[model samples]
Target: MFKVYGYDSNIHKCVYCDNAKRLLTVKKQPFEFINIMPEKGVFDDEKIAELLTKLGRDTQIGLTMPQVFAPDGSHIGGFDQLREYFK
Candidate 1:
């Protein structure tokens, strides 16, 4: 039901991102997870800007993290929204 675009941890795990994946797992929902981090504990400004712009420039980039999309390729939003939708 979702495609998760998120961080790749080298420094420390992205908790919210991991949580989202965990939630999906418990829900028995299959999803492809993508790693967007250029560096662990760090996201490049340009990369984020590019992704944010690609995502329609959704005001805050933080809300763009762990972004999820439905199976039909329609965006559902970030972790919080994922919880709301799946819950």
Candidate 2:
């Protein structure tokens, strides 16, 4: 199983993210999607910032939405890498 951390907008608007989700679904790949959108300030930017830190993302370098991770908690990069990984 894999985990996908992404924003609500990107999940639909991002071509790569959309394709990734579709591919995983069609292939019956097990994955969890974590939406980092603020739900009444519960899952706010601060929460996402903390998650980014846990993922070892450099805040200075900026963060890309839809970060994918393997079952072992190892980052598998974004949509581009996801496509390559399952290929």
Candidate 3:
């Protein structure tokens, strides 16, 4: 299963942050931390488009699908939802 870990000092700490921190405290495994913010451009549509464009070109193929995540870093939508825009 895929897991997403996010951090935002502006907002309250993430629900799973403490759990992950605890794991680190036990010297188990390293936790992944991603800064999620629209202002910083992580959640920006323009930036997403630019990123997709680069990825698409890198493979020399157009991406017919794309995905979006909720503000809380939850997966909200994907290719089927974005394919129309690509068209």
Candidate 4:
């Protein structure tokens, strides 16, 4: 399974994220999308911040929206990486 954490605004503004979602849908891959924006409330602000921070630390990569994780709980990076993985 794959999990995606991103902001709502990015759904339109981010080409990569959009592509990622589209690809997953077309391929019928199971994925979870977590909206980190406060308004969405999928997670509280503090929890969202904490999760981003922890992900960055664990992956040794700068945090970015649309963060993707593999089933093993390893960071699989964003859309670019996701596309590569599916390929």
Best by TM-score: 2
How close is every model to the real structure, measured as TM-score? 0.64, 0.66, 0.30, 0.63
| Model 3 accuracy (lDDT, Cα) | 0.39
Local distance difference test, per candidate? 0.69, 0.71, 0.39, 0.69
User: Worst ten-residue run, lDDT, model 2?
Assistant: 7-16
lDDT of 1 at 53: 62
Regions of model 1 farther than 4 Å from truth: 38-63
Candidate 1: residue pairs that collide: none
Q: What TM-score does model 4 achieve against the real structure?
A: 0.63
lDDT tens digits by residue: candidate 4, 9-49: 64334556667888889878888777666563254567466
Better of 1 and 2 by TM-score: 2
- Could you tell me the TM-score of candidate 2? 0.66
The local lDDT score (0 to 100) that residue 24 gets in candidate 2 is: 82
**Residue 27 Cα positional deviation in candidate 1, in Å, after optimal superposition:** 0.9
In terms of lDDT, which candidate is stronger, 2 or 3?
Answer: 2
Predicted model with the maximum lDDT: 2
For every model shown, the clashing-pair count is 0, 0, 0, 0
Show the lowest summed lDDT stretch of 10 residues, model 3: 63-72
Error of 1 at 33 (Å): 1.2
* Pairs in clash, predicted candidate 4: none
lDDT of 3 by residue, 1-87 (tens): 112224445643454444444433455433344443446435545545444453344542543222333333344233343233223
